[PDB]
Design a protein around this ligand. Structure first.
Ligand SMILES: NC(=O)CC[C@H](N)C(=O)O
Ligand SMILES: NC(=O)CC[C@H](N)C(=O)O
Ligand SMILES: NC(=O)CC[C@H](N)C(=O)O
Ligand SMILES: [Mg+2]
Ligand SMILES: [Mg+2]
Ligand SMILES: [Mg+2]
Ligand SMILES: [Mg+2]
Ligand SMILES: [Mg+2]
Ligand SMILES: [Mg+2]
Lengths: 441, 10, 441, 441, 10, 10, 10, 10
């Protein structure tokens, strides 16, 4: 941990000249206010004002005034600063009256965690699995369409291809304070994955943001381009951000039950049922972009139907074989483009809603591949995820459970942002249309 | 079921 | 502070070889007289004569003789001089008889501050928010039309886009003696903002001039071009110089009133009413160029109507949420192309005139966006800012309050300069006309 | 003249394959409906329907249905058609109920001529003086900035500079049925003027439209570009369309009065007074574009003040020395970009309004050049023409006399078109601004 | 309004 | 209503 | 005022 | 009259 005096001590010792007061907007982009070290005490006194309307993105209408409340435990010094050391602090957004801002994603996650604690659950242990692609750049420094390598699942090419920009990223993250579990080459060419050790929800989301920033910076250093686009290329695997979750009550995993056949407590089953019922409503948050639904197509391990299994091609919810204190519920819908705070908040709220109502878990899907017809699917009661952003937005609007998780202020602005994005997307004439038509017609 | 893995032949 | 002996001591110690006796003309351009260190005592004795007619710009008709009276508190040594150290002093212009020159903008601001002190207000605390654009240069060293980056509001770019040059500017300013509050990326690409801590009006204007000079020099060092042009590009946000003002009487903020519903004293309300009443007359000074009125167009957060609010799209006057000793009135008309001394002088004079006549504050504008018709606007008594430089000049001439603030000598020369500029602009045939016409007709 | 049987006879004899049913929109652009010769009888029966909303330009809101009523006297066969002969007919726009469309400029001129005939004036004899520029084209066929020659006033360069595309245009117009008076070189390099003999107002406007089309076509044939843009270049003379008018009552010139000192009847003086009174209101019609007011600047013989004289630099109204049946009133405001029908209609309506109310003619301006101050100008009661399109539009709206000449339907659409054009123009950032600023600021 | 705000799509 | 009509300025 | 007339020298 | 100073526009 850290204290004010500790922060000042390292800042003087490390010769830190500039401090980034980092926060996140509704779209998951990392925003910051640069600060000279002479303002560190003022920042630590929670007295820095900024617009605050920058959270709304490009749909902001009026300028507000909000305070930055830095979190002392998030202090870190970037290793690449070299000459002039630059540090960062992750801050919460507070209204001038003293109450937290309702539109801050971090505050939303904190509020959902608080109402979880109100039910006796001390913490939510989250381990994400973000995947990314590496692209070669051109002379101008822009990404091309060529992958950095052509490796496969768990491939090993020590020279410049298999690891490439994965060893140095892990080394820098380790120096930065990360707990890295393992790294490997992903299924698609040029795709890599780095796993962290499990942490609490807020820490996990902060680590996801920092990891994305660090990966992008290090890839840029090596003349490469790192992207967390859900589906950068057609015909190859997309990138997912599978989230492993387990509820804890005083160092006790409430998902574990040795007496159960699958080692799953009734609490875990209610959690899974709640996540399953609200999946279509959550899709607009866990899959927020237009490109997110190009990944949710059959044949690339991405989930396309709302179901759970212990072993299947692509279930919405998967249960890893680990038991005991490591029994987990893995949700595979999210892509790395999702906002970590909002995604974790909506998943936790759906699970808590399932727990509260003693919801009944549907039967798991067996090795029955979904080659079955739609009549078989809705006969067996297997729902499907939304086919595009428009359906997800409509389900989001109609939902009363996870809209409460978002809150009244953030829901309207998120809906406006996504509606504008979809409207701009739907009126474009793509090259595919000019290839199919313009000669035939 | 398999498409992105068979990309080695494509 | 500094004294004559102190200045001589640092000049000998720092090996200062050249001294710039800096002053400002009516157009805000920084002018100087270069001096060898052997003439420092003569300069400090207020004995240096120069033309003085250079204040009038290109409309000067006859050469005069005027003395430079350096301000010892403005002494600073430039950091980039390296080999031969160069220092600067900001000087006031005095007639040979001993009286200050009536056409000196710094003297104008000093006179307005003196007549403010005559009402019991010891100081006027000013915090400006100047914004600037960064453009890439060509081989010859001329600015191209391409921005240095493509970031957004409060965007994070640790590589060399948003920061890098910005960090270097902040570092240089800290050495100079600038108390930097915070720096951040602005809405438009290549647009950046650096904020200083609040200071007295004369010091604030001196800091604005020095800041512009330093930013331009540092940007040139990195092969970039920095501009404070109000609207360098069509379709993107312009650059403003929002000025935060508060009147002080013996380190007591007279704008504060805890008993008031908004925490605003009657003095502050009278000040704001006075500023609103004379806004159209001040527009020619706070928005002095032709390009200034291309910024004052709807849809880019620049004010277009004379009104005040605590939360709106783009009010003329905005009142930040801070209270206590930091209660402020923010005027958002000025652009960085304005003369800081003249702009602060006219704003303070308008506020004092409102205080003296005890003008009634008009009702604030609510979230009612100005999509309302012109009939609705003039039914509610909402005036609009001048549409171009000609209207502003006519209002300036017709005004008897802020023309007195300018004084008889400076008003005539400013009017001549702006009339010549507008006449040159209005007879040009632009490429837009040749694009619309020359084929259709 | 011509009849239906005559038209069919020439169409069969001349092997005409295609017929253009020509009309004009509110902006003066020539629009047409192409017709195969097999539909000539249907066209001559006044049975062809078209949109009719195309008159409104780009501000049309809904599609209508309107009939084309060809004018048989306007029949002509283009000479350059060669292989497949193409003919044209100028048509009036009629509503399906049978009444003429109120928004048709030709119908507007016809209605004003009818209300003139109601006062006993059988015809209005009009002779225009349209001037145009010739520009050299590039390989792609686009106009460059280089003039075709460098001649002067009434210069003579037989080889390729003096006449060039002026002899051929006159020859083609003569073969087409025009009555050409003379042609000569104008003020600026590449500027030429061709004058026709006087005709009735409707015929004069039809001839102006046909002349513009023919000049453009012939210039394109010789690899040149012909433009009627009022001020294509800065610093050189613009192009005007001085209109000579005289009212006739049974082949008697009512403007003539041998007993008068100037040979001017009281009717002519009332006409000129009426034109002078409403000049600022008519400016938006006779000078319709933004570029029109770059021509109305001093020093290039374009009128800038509302006054009349028999000999002056640039009077608004000039009276030529010819007397008898050729006594005329020359109005020099219009540029060739103006709509001929609308311009003639508003000028005639203003003159008739002056006649009806018996307005008193102001004193003519002597050789007193307008170097006099603005105080001298408004002391003598000399009004000035609007400085830009916005002022002209405001005067147009405020006017009740010539707005009646336009009518209710056409006025609203013309105002919308010009408001959109001005709004598009005023928000542009021109290269002149980037040259003055972006370095100094 | 938000004209310059929507420049990311343009 | 008029978007494709205003393309002459764009 | 002769401005466009004196263009031969300019 | 004061033309040597107006060269900035020229
Ligand atoms: N876990 C894997 O084998 C890869 C998962 C796949 N990339 C997805 O988007 O879900
Ligand atoms: N987001 C903002 O408030 C920026 C203001 C804008 N740049 C202006 O010129 O006023
Ligand atoms: N001197 C002349 O007759 C030319 C007239 C001038 N070209 C104009 O536009 O008015
Ligand atoms: Mg994986
Ligand atoms: Mg997984
Ligand atoms: Mg700003
Ligand atoms: Mg501001
Ligand atoms: Mg002529
Ligand atoms: Mg003439």
């Amino acid at each position: 941990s850290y204290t004010r005096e500790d922060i000042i001590r390292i800042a003087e010792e490390e010769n830190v000249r500039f401090i980034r007061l980092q926060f996140t907007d509704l779209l998951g982009t990392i925003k910051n206010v640069e600060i000279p070290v002479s303002q560190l005490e003022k920042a630590l006194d929670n007295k820095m004002m900024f617009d605050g309307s920058s959270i709304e993105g490009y749909v902001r209408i009026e300028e507000s005034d909000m305070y930055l409340y830095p979190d002392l435990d998030t202090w870190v010094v970037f290793p690449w600063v070299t000459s002039d050391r630059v540090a960062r602090l992750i801050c919460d957004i507070y209204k001038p009256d003293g109450s937290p801002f309702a539109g801050d994603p971090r505050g939303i996650l904190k509020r959902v965690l608080k109402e979880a604690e109100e039910l006796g659950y001390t913490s939510m242990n989250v381990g994400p699995e973000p995947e990314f692609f590496l692209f070669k750049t051109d002379e101008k420094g822009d990404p091309t369409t060529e992958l950095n390598d052509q490796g496969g699942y768990f491939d090993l090419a020590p020279m410049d291809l298999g690891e490439n920009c994965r060893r140095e990223i892990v080394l820098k993250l380790e120096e930065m304070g990360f707990e890295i579990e393992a790294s490997h080459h992903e299924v698609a060419p040029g795709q890599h994955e780095i796993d962290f050790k499990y942490a609490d929800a807020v820490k996990a989301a902060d680590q996801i943001q920092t990891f994305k920033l660090v990966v992008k910076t290090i890839a840029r250093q090596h003349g490469l381009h790192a992207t967390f686009m859900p589906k950068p290329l057609f015909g190859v695997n997309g990138s997912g951000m599978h989230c492993n979750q387990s509820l804890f009550k005083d160092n006790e995993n409430v998902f574990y039950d040795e007496t159960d056949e699958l080692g799953l407590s009734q609490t875990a089953r209610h959690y899974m049922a709640g996540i399953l019922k609200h999946a279509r409503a959550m899709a607009a948050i866990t899959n927020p972009t237009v490109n997110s639904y190009k990944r949710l197509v059959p044949g690339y391990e991405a989930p396309c139907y709302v179901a759970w299994s212990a072993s299947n091609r692509s279930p919405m919810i998967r249960i890893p074989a680990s038991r005991g204190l490591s029994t987990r519920v893995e949700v595979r819908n999210p892509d790395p483009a999702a906002n970590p705070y909002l995604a974790l908040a909506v998943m936790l709220r759906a699970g808590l809603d399932g727990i509260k109502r003693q919801m009944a878990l549907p039967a798991p899907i067996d090795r029955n591949i979904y080659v079955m017809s739609e009549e078989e699917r809705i006969e067996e009661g297997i729902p499907s995820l939304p086919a595009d952003l428009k359906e997800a937005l409509s389900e989001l609007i109609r939902s009363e459970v996870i809209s409460d998780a978002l809150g009244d202020h953030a829901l309207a602005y998120f809906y406006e942002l996504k509606e504008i994005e979809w409207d701009m997307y739907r009126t474009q004439v793509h090259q595919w249309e000019r290839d199919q038509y313009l000669t035939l017609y | 079921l398999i498409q992105g893995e068979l990309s080695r032949f494509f």
